[PDB]
């Protein structure tokens, strides 16, 4: 149909993106799950015991029926506060991952679309190669039936034709499997896609690499995730440090009991009482053997690990940006080179035909020139499509990949073409 | 030896499969580990305190020697029941993974076997190519020593011979490394394997793709694992919902104590008592700040995630099945094409020899035709072996991969051949 | 600059290695975190309640102000001891992983260095190929302007020149991206590297494969990690078995309270008391429903799993060693073969030039011979560099990879060469 519509259908019906969204929302709710303990923790309890006497208390039994409405509340517990902040930061991380999955979806959809298109172009060029080989083979066959050309040329052409047939089979299989991958990405089978407009296709030199690097270190996603994890490790250090601190707990209750002491020797008086109390509960772990002073060092070493992960991510980002810039410029230069190559190879094929007419060159040279020509055409098409893919990879490293780049692309796509075979 | 015996030795002595089996059994025992808490939790305790008086209780000491035979039991705790069911479902999942590992073992063993065989065939064809090149080179050398052919042809043939030597070295290394991988899979080194019977080799068109897809969505393993995980997520939702519910606990004891109050101001009476009691313990978390109402939403979002994983698995399965069907048909068509190509290339080589005898064609064309012929033979052999591998991949996507398919294959294998070099 | 200096800069400024070191130290501190509980666990508590009377205790209130200096200590708890030993073993495992990361760093640095060098050599040979093609094209152009050669040869040469231009573009891009990867590894951009000294380059047959296998099974790192995990599983079995055992706990306190009973019906006497006690606390889980007898079976099955992982690691090690030995010998044989091929191809190119002068051979054959010659040169260079890489892979499987092997290598490197283009 088109690239934009394909991305729409994907975004609407892609499961990996939906799973990342689910995880994001699950984290944003784990936030409340962690806020819970800082809120009142009202409860309720009961009991019914039957005490007896095994020795020295013989015949002194009892029948209790107790209830309780225990309530709890936390006035100072920094560990829970830090866990809450940690969960907020993890939610931010999962949001970043959702963004990354959006970008990955756009990129994979475009990659599959252009793989399908390159497969179509390759199949068409291979079929054209086969047709040209068959034309030459038929010419030689007729000129042999009359008595001009020898069986040698016929057999050479037959061999080349068979090889081309095998290559065509391979190309058809590749095209079908590419359509299947496109389906796996989007969900539907596309019998007609939007082709490329080479009559107006043009390449634009990318922007300065230093500006790309600034925009990347500012807006990239893996780097952002790394620095978020660094902040998370800092907060973990603080969480561990908070182990040295006290923990208040405003308790409360509405206790009630119904004692019914029984037995012969039972002397105590049956009492049905109710006890309501409200009090605090301090705590201060003076010493624990080194749990806190060890968790702190662990958290500091994990913070070091996160800092090093951040540096590694910066290096990977620089590599990605530089490689994408370089291979974009390379795709441009190769487009130009393969254009010149196609022109020169068509000229050389005409010259080889002239020579075969004369007698200098041989049909094998003609067929090799034809193969070279059509291989050059294939390489040119693949270079165009790789240029597009590499532009997208650039815009991905920058984290500025969105439907707008896909619109800029779709502006390029022109007439439709079938995925048949 | 043969493919069936190789698979037997593997299944008997493959460590990855054994590890998956170990994990399966570990889960089936974690079942009982989780059933435990629902069973009585009898225990035993003791104590020996020496109380004193810091202020207002001075000279009022004590010496207690207490014992206890605490017993516990759970009459209503849905969280534990749901954990038990969860562990049962995880055991089912691990069983599915064990099945998947069985299939993967069969497939990897066959892949390695056929890689070794293709390496042997490639090495043999390369050696034959070298021998033909040397025959032509010796013919030219003699015809030059007599004074017919020029040094030019000798040097061309020498160059081609050297290139073939290098390719032969590469092929020998590949064969040896393939034998080593086969060993890594099975455990033993195989100096004689069972070759292919091309004199009776034939290709059977696979069954309809729609029937394949039905059988796959019914019997595939990744899809089954995905739906099992979906059910697991449902049970997790119920487990979380169960947080709103009460929790009974039938307590019990046989308490005994021996108080020996000491001190000058000690007025209480020394008592050696025994207290046996049996009672219940209700519980009802009216409010907790949102822990349950948050765990529930988390579980619902994880259920959504599992549903999306299931859809992704369905898509991947469709892709796998369609790709396997397509590349099977492609292997058939390529077998036929490369057969025709080998025939035509042998004919063209004979024609080039005739031409070199005449004077039209040149020795370079002869050697290029020979190289084409033997490359075509290599491609044909590799196409056969890939057809077999792709049949196996089909039967894997369907989840119907077992020793029976390997027997159907081994029926194909014929005379033995050595892995030497 | 050089290989040794590059490895120095890497080791000093590589983030992955630093992260592995951080994890190692974090484990060696988790050791103390786990030793903690076996040490005194002094604490401190307080309380302030206001009891009332709901029914039958009306007007019998209270105002307590309690304190406590609870102390704890563990005299027999085998679970904690086994956890301590487990953490020690995990620290050993992480140390092994740090060693593995050191080796991986050395190997990746060398791989990137030699990839860059091979890219430089390939680019230079491609530029030389282009220059030779242009020389032949200019000769033909002049001989056509005078009236000797036909437009046919001119066009053939033009086509070949264009193809070479495209290949040169690809090579330049590959070189730049390789330099970028080298940067990602080390941290700095290297405009001048140390080239290879082919004038004294030589290959040494590796040592016997059986000795390699002994040294590997003795000093390899994955195998060592596997057996360490096996021992860890044994200790886990013992940890689970320890669930049957008792658990003493030397309690202690310095309790103090200030009761201020209030109310009209309040008859009890206000008391400000202090209670200091010190006692033990036994424990003996006679029955638990099968938790211990199930954890034990789980640990035994996990021990089986670790044993199978160990066997798999042994097999993978054997495969790695045998493959490295084989492909080293293959690199040697291919070096020799490609040397002979380069010599013979240069001779054949001279012969083709002579023939074109005569009239037998054609310019297409000349250019094909030139392409073959320079492809052979590329293959020779790549074979040298792969021989070096495979020597390093050998020394890696043996676990004997260190700065000394890099020094042995750097001894090979000679004059410098630029990474420009």
Author numbering:
A (entry chain B), B (entry chain C), C (entry chain A): 1 to 421
Copy out sentences from the published article reporting this entry, exactly as the authors wrote them.
Here, we use biochemical, biophysical and structural analyses to show how a bacteriocin exploits TolC, a major outer-membrane antibiotic efflux channel in Gram-negative bacteria, to transport itself across the outer membrane of target cells. Klebicin C (KlebC), a rRNase toxin produced by Klebsiella pneumoniae, binds TolC of a related species (K. quasipneumoniae) with high affinity through an N-terminal, elongated helical hairpin domain common amongst bacteriocins. TolC is one of the most prevalent drug efflux channels in bacteria and is frequently associated with multidrug resistance. Our results indicate that TolC, in addition to its known role in antibiotic export, can function as a protein import channel for bacteriocins.
K. quasipneumoniae Qmp M1-977 is a KlebC susceptible strain in which TolC (KqTolC) shares 83% sequence identity with E. coli K-12 TolC. KqTolC was expressed and purified for single-particle cryo-EM studies to resolve the structure of the KqTolC-KlebC1-254 complex. KqTolC is a 150-kDa homotrimer comprised of 50-kDa subunits, each contributing four β-strands to form a single 12-stranded β-barrel across the outer membrane. The remainder of each subunit adopts a helical structure forming an elongated channel. Whilst the β-barrel in the membrane is exposed to the extracellular environment the α-helical segment of the protein forms an iris in the periplasm. The position of extracellular loops within the structure defines the accessible size of the β-barrel, creating a more open configuration in KqTolC relative to E. coli TolC. Although some local distortions are observed at the iris where helices meet, none significantly alter the effective diameter of the iris (4–5 Å at its narrowest point). We can discount the possibility that these sequences pass between the periplasmic helices of the TolC channel since the positions of the helices are essentially identical in the KlebC-bound and unliganded forms of KqTolC.
